[PDB]
Amino acid sequence: MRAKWAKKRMRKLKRKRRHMKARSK
Amino acid sequence: MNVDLLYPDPVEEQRKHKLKRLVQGPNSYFLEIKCAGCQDIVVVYSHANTPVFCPGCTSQISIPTGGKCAFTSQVERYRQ
């Protein structure tokens, strides 16, 4: 799996983005 | 054999499905049965899927079948 690993990497960035937004909001 | 659809051999129409005929219509017909007191015609539906009863009797003349209905007594062909 190489494209699914890219999708997993995006989902983790998307999840870190939502925790970061919460800290600054 | 230069037969055309306008006049198809009777057996061809009789072999094909009753809707896929150049002239569509009934596959079934009326076939007689014999009963007590009767040497005459006792017509019944050929493909009866329901019980027909001995005229003036309790017992059922034709056995139920998805196809042509079968019988347990003496019977007479088509119309006579």
């Binding site: - | 499905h17 002239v23 009934p26 079934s28 009326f30 017509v43 539906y45």
Partner: protein, 150 residues
């Protein structure tokens, strides 16, 4: 091809090309017309009468031996079911499924058959309502199906 399944079959009943009254041994018109009405007082459904002459009497299609369809002959004597036969037959079946489902909410295939059986009722009743066969006030309700049935 089936309204609620991907089935394209063609199992159909047939009517004769020569549209003329039975030469096997047909009865008198007024007598057959009265005979169909007499069997409807015993409650025989319209399909069942058309079937009964076909095995019990001499012709399957009453219109050729008589002058008109089984329900038009019955209707003059007021024997046309108030709810048209087609709707009523499906409404009967829907209630039986509702009973099976009452005991167990587990069955899913049956729930698919209810969301299909009752869909047809709404469509056919809707056809009947504009045609005036069914009054505008009448409408199918799933909870009230048994009450409509009787």
């Amino acid at each position: 091809g089936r309204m609620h399944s991907k089935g394209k079959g063609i199992s159909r009943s047939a009517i004769p090309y020569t549209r003329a009254p039975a030469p096997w041994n047909k009865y008198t018109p007024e007598d057959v017309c009265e005979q169909i009405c007499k069997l409807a007082k015993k409650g025989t459904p319209p399909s069942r009468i058309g079937l009964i002459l076909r095995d019990q009497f001499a012709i399957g299609q009453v219109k050729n031996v008589t002058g008109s369809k089984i329900v038009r002959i019955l209707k003059a004597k007021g024997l046309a079911p108030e709810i048209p036969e087609d709707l009523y037959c499906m409404i009967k079946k829907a209630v039986a499924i509702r009973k099976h489902l009452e005991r167990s909410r587990r069955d899913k295939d049956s729930k698919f058959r209810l969301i299909l059986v009752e869909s047809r009722i709404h469509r056919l009743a809707r056809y009947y309502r504009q045609a005036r066969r069914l009054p505008p006030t009448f409408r199918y309700k799933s909870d009230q199906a048994a009450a409509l049935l009787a």
